[PDB]
Structure formats: structure tokens, C-alpha cells
């Protein structure tokens, strides 16, 4: 179920939204210019702050933006609950992590971020 | 196998590169020289320090430099949680098979 919240629905954050939007789009809006400087896209994003200040709201906005971008050209955004991947068997959790990352890198391409 | 890494990429770590050369590269380059002085080659090298200080960088650099230095070498990378299986079996079988293959490649003559 694609969320229906966009960047226009978030207020009071004209800087953090700008930073995450840059880190998500700029490496893929201008691939050749990034390659000219040999600057790779960032691979680690962390969001922290007091409870109920808009972190999940920004996550939903990013998901909606990715959905719109892909529809312009659905399964690229992967949502994982915190302890969801945890399993009682000893080796199942590591195998699940590896399978998730392998599937994510399977669909990864230069023009399509995952 | 990870190519395209060398000591030239790593900067600011001069003594440690020399030590890792002495412990690893030197026994392979010189064996009769070690046997003349009855000096047993060091078998195990551990790398420790603050996170992100370049342990994996030095590892891949030495892995490539061993191949480039000799005038066919095999580098094996295995992680901890990789060799864990939910079944009662294969928890130890995989490790024993890996070491048997390492011994086989050593018998072939290629350093492992």
C-alpha cells in the first residue's frame, strides 16, 4: 500500500528534508557529473531525534517520492520492522539478512536506487 | 577475490605495513633463509584498533600484494555468522571442509 504523504505535507523542516532529498536524488539526478568528480552515492543514512518529530513521516515521504519516480519510468523501497527479522532458530536470522541484501542488490542499478 | 588495492592506497600507516610484510610476505619470499636460522614463521596475525582505522583495507592490500610480489596465490575470506547453520549438522562440517580445501591448495603449492 503506497503511502500518500509527500514533501509538501511536512513543515518546519526545510534543512533536514533538503539533506535527505539531496542524498537520495542528486547522485541519481546527475550521474555523469558525479562520475566526473568520482563521488559515489552515500550508502548510510541515519535519522534520530526526540519521539514524534517526523522521522517516519520523512520515511513515508521518501517512499512516496520513489513510487512516483518509478511510476514515471513499487518494489524498490524495502520496509523492515525492527525485530521482525529476528527468529528463534540459530542460523535463520543471518540467512534472512543475507537473502534480503542479495535480493536488494539484485534489482540495484545505476539509474534506479534501492 | 577483491582486486585493485595496494599499500600505495593506504597512507599514514608505515610501521604496520612493514610488520605485516615481515610476518606474511617474508616467509613466502624466503623459506630456506628462515630454515637456516631455525626461525619458525609466525602462523597467526590479528589486527585490532578503533573502528574504521583500516583493518580490512590492510587485509585486502596484503592479499593483493602477496600475489603481486612473487615472481596463483589463493586468498580465502570467510565471516563468522556465515558458517552458522540452523541444523545440528554442517555447523562444524563447513569449517572442516574449508580447512581441508586450504590444505589441498597448500599441497598444490599456492600460498593460502
Amino acid at each position: 500500500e503506497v503511502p500518500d504523504v509527500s514533501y509538501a505535507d511536512i513543515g518546519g523542516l526545510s534543512r533536514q528534508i533538503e539533506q535527505i532529498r539531496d542524498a537520495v536524488e542528486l547522485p541519481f539526478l546527475h550521474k555523469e557529473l558525479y562520475r566526473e568528480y568520482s563521488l559515489r552515492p552515500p550508502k548510510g543514512v541515519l535519522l534520530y531525534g526526540p519521539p514524534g518529530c517526523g522521522k517516519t513521516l520523512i520515511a513515508k515521504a521518501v517512499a512516496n517520492s520513489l513510487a512516483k519516480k518509478m511510476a514515471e519510468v513499487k518494489s524498490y523501497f524495502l520496509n523492515i520492522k525492527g525485530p521482525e527479522l529476528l527468529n528463534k532458530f540459530v542460523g535463520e536470522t543471518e540467512r534472512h539478512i543475507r537473502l534480503i541484501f542479495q535480493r536488494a542488490r539484485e534489482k540495484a542499478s545505476e539509474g534506479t536506487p534501492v | 577475490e577483491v582486486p585493485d588495492v595496494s599499500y600505495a592506497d593506504i597512507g599514514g600507516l608505515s610501521r604496520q605495513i612493514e610488520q605485516i610484510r615481515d610476518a606474511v610476505e617474508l616467509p613466502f619470499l624466503h623459506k630456506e633463509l628462515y630454515r637456516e636460522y631455525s626461525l619458525r614463521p609466525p602462523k597467526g596475525v590479528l589486527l585490532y584498533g578503533p573502528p574504521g582505522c583500516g583493518k580490512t583495507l590492510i587485509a585486502k592490500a596484503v592479499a593483493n600484494s602477496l600475489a603481486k610480489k612473487m615472481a596463483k596465490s589463493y586468498f580465502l575470506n570467510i565471516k563468522g555468522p556465515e558458517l552458522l547453520n540452523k541444523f545440528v549438522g554442517e555447523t562444524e562440517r563447513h569449517i572442516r571442509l574449508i580447512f581441508q580445501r586450504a590444505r589441498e591448495k597448500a599441497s598444490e603449492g599456492t600460498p593460502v
Partner: peptide, 17 residues
């Protein structure tokens, strides 16, 4: 000086007939 409570991790087991 503290007490702990254990959570078990089940190991796979399968038999035929």
C-alpha cells in the same frame, strides 16, 4: 551481582516416519 533469565534458541530436527 545480578540475575538473568534465559531465552532458548531451537535447533532444527527432522525424522522420517
Amino acid at each position: 551481582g545480578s540475575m538473568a533469565q534465559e531465552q532458548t534458541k531451537r535447533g532444527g530436527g527432522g525424522g522420517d516416519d
